Each structure stands twice: as structure tokens, then as C-alpha cells.
Write a protein that binds this ligand. Structure first.
Ligand SMILES: NC(=O)C1=CN([C@@H]2O[C@H](COP(=O)(O)OP(=O)(O)OC[C@H]3O[C@@H](n4cnc5c(N)ncnc54)[C@H](OP(=O)(O)O)[C@@H]3O)[C@@H](O)[C@H]2O)C=CC1
Length: 342
């Protein structure tokens, strides 16, 4: 019995691989190159329960054919986490929409073709971006929940890369639900979506702390490099720690009740002010070297937007989430260890 993890070297995915290995699953991941694959197995101490396959590009609809061709019989759980979340891009349709959508369509078709009778559970790493309305997050009267969907269309979301990325998550997820609709009789697997907000926390391995991080964590790395007189980025959203997100993925395949659900993994709201308040208080080396802003005016003290109601998800997942202080501390301290500031 095996668990397949697409994009296994990713920020979230490495923490998933971690939790799977500790719960004694055999794990198979994919990475874009033999190099990244070998680096990942090595980092995990060449665990004999862990192996990797090379899947260079998920925009290819037959990208996952080979893994399910040869391992389909042994694969019981599929966690599809790979999706472009990168912004040095030339074209939204081609660098965001097509790969994310074809990634989902491809892997599910690979399952149908080679593992229709063995794969019991599929979990898709979607996003809160597939749930919310960007133009409306700022409105205190409105409410978003698991039944909410991103209103943007193919074409409309192509206005800018951030919108396109959000659309890509929406359409990759819609495609997964549509595929299960259209093939319900022809496949055995049940589907769950996991929909994280902004994901913070430490990288699985210290080696992977570099000058610039994965985009969600870069937001903290970036803040820690602003000078006191620099302008504070405007951002309002939910937050969640990466170890909590990884655990949400395990619970999403292990539980009966998470069959056919969308699970928003979100603890509470934040703005950058809330992140500054924490950095300033917990890291003396940062105080006086970063902005202060207006302390206490962030979302950890004020209702500043629409209500994210993920109470259903919190109840389905059945464990409590790290607060902002804990997740920001772990991110920042790990980075300061790489900068040599402690
Ligand atoms: N971080 C966050 O705040 C949130 C993340 N997510 C989702 O979580 C998932 C992982 O993101 P995260 O870990 O945060 O960021 P990462 O950039 O670290 O993870 C992205 C992963 O996807 C792989 N990937 C991207 N494009 C392709 C491609 N075209 N072909 C093959 N592999 C590809 C990457 O490979 P490589 O590293 O080699 O480039 C990497 O393994 C994504 O699906 C993302 O949408 C959802 C909500 C919030």
C-alpha cells in the first residue's frame, strides 16, 4: 500500500511527506528532476519507505502515466499538491491556468487508466483563492465559507497574474469535481479538496532556507528585510501554519466524513501589522531595524474584513491550529539562523 505525493519537494508537500513517514506509510513522490528527487530522499535520511519519480511538467496531460503504469496497483492514496505558485511568468493562461488545470486532468486520467480499482482516496491541494472574492474580502458585512466559490471566469481572471493564479486554483479544483462527476461509475476513489489560506511556518529542512523563499513564506522573509522608513505592504487574509496544513491533508484522506468536502485550513485573520507586532516583540535583533507601523491595529485585534467561516472544516479536521505568534516565530527564527543573527 502506498501514498503518492505530487510535487513532493514543495514547501507544504515536504511536511506532508514528513507526517506520512512518521505514521508508517510507504510514500512515493514526484519531482521535476532526478536531482531534486535525490536531494529529497537524501534529506529524509534515505528512508526505505520513501521513493521518488521524475515528473518534469504537469502541463502535460500524460505526465503521471508512467508512475501509475508501474505503481498504480500499489497506490491507495493520491495527494495531488503540485501547482504553479510562481510569478516570474510571461503569460497567465500558459504559465498558470493550463499547467494547474492539466495537472489535475492529467493525474486523474492516469488514475482512471492504470489504477481505477486500487486508488481509494484522492486529495487535492486547492486554495482559499478558489473560495473567496478578492474584490470583496474588505467588506465586513459579507461571509465566505466552504460552499463559497471564486466568481472569476476563465478570461476574467486573466486581468493580472495574482487573479490568474486564483482562477487557476478555482479551475483546477472545478476540473477535479467535474472529473469525479463524469466518471463516478468508472472509478473507485473518493475526492477531498484542502483549501489553505496563506501558509507560513518553517521549511522542512534548514538547507532550504535561502535568500528568497516559496512565495507565501517570502512575504515574511521580505518583511524582515524592510528598513524602518520603508512602506508596509497592504495585505489582509487568513493564516495557517504549514504543519497544520500538512496534517489537514492526512486527516482529509483518513476520515470518512471528509469524503466530498472542501476543507478551508485557516486559523484566523492577519495583516502585515500583526506580523510586525510579533517580529518586533519576539526578536530584539529586529526591533529598531524593521517598520513598527501602528501597533495593535492589525486583524489580531480588529475585525477588518469579510468573515471567513471555516467552522465546519475546523470540526471535520478535529485538531487545534497554531496561532500567528507561533507560526511567525518559527518562520522568522529559522530565517535568522540562516542569516546568522539568532
Ligand atoms: N503557500 C501557500 O500560502 C498556499 C499554497 N497552496 C497550494 O499548495 C501547493 C504547493 O504550494 P507551496 O508548497 O506553497 O509552494 P511551492 O512553490 O514550494 O510548491 C509548488 C510545487 O509544485 C511544483 N510545480 C509547480 N509547477 C509545476 C509544473 N508545471 N510541473 C511540475 N511541478 C510543478 C513545484 O516544483 P518545483 O519546486 O521544482 O518548482 C513544487 O514542488 C500548490 O498547489 C499551491 O497552490 C494553496 C494555498 C496557499
Amino acid at each position: 500500500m502506498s501514498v503518492f505525493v505530487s510535487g513532493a519537494n514543495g514547501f507544504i508537500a515536504q511536511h506532508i511527506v514528513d507526517l506520512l513517514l512518521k505514521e508508517d506509510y510507504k510514500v512515493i513522490g514526484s519531482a521535476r528532476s532526478q536531482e531534486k528527487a535525490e536531494n529529497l530522499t537524501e534529506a529524509f535520511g534515505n528512508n526505505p519507505k520513501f521513493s521518488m519519480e521524475v515528473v518534469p511538467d504537469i502541463s502535460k496531460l500524460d505526465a503521471f502515466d508512467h508512475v501509475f503504469q508501474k505503481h498504480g496497483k500499489d497506490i491507495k492514496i493520491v495527494l495531488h499538491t503540485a501547482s504553479p505558485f510562481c510569478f516570474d511568468i510571461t503569460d497567465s493562461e500558459r504559465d498558470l491556468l493550463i499547467p494547474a488545470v492539466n495537472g489535475v486532468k492529467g493525474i486523474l486520467h492516469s488514475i482512471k487508466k492504470y489504477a481505477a480499482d486500487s486508488v481509494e482516496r484522492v486529495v487535492l491541494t486547492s486554495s482559499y483563492a478558489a473560495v473567496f472574492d478578492m474584490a470583496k474580502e474588505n467588506d465586513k458585512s459579507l461571509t465566505f465559507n466552504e460552499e463559497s466559490w471564486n466568481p472569476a471566469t476563465w478570461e476574467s481572471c486573466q486581468s493580472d497574474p495574482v487573479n490568474a493564479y486564483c482562477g487557476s486554483k478555482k479551475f483546477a479544483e472545478k476540473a477535479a469535481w467535474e472529473f469525479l462527476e463524469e466518471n463516478r461509475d468508472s472509478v473507485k476513489f473518493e475526492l477531498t479538496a484542502v483549501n489553505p489560506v496563506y501558509v507560513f511556518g518553517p521549511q522542512m529542512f534548514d538547507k532550504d532556507v535561502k535568500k528568497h523563499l516559496n512565495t507565501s513564506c517570502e512575504l515574511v522573509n521580505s518583511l524582515m528585510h524592510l528598513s524602518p522608513e520603508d512602506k508596509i505592504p497592504e495585505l489582509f487574509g487568513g493564516y495557517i501554519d504549514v504543519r497544520d496544513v500538512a496534517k489537514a491533508h492526512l486527516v482529509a484522506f483518513q476520515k470518512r466524513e471528509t469524503i466530498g468536502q472542501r476543507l478551508i485550513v485557516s486559523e484566523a485573520r492577519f495583516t502585515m501589522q500583526d506580523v510586525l507586532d510579533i517580529l518586533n516583540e519576539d526578536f530584539p535583533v529586529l526591533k529598531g531595524n524593521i517598520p513598527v507601523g501602528k501597533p495593535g491595529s492589525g486583524a489580531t485585534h480588529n475585525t477588518l474584513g469579510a468573515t471567513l467561516d471555516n467552522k465546519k472544516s475546523k470540526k471535520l479536521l478535529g485538531f487545534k491550529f497554531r496561532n500567528l505568534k507561533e507560526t511567525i516565530d518559527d518562520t522568522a527564527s529559522q530565517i535568522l539562523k540562516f542569516e546568522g543573527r539568532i
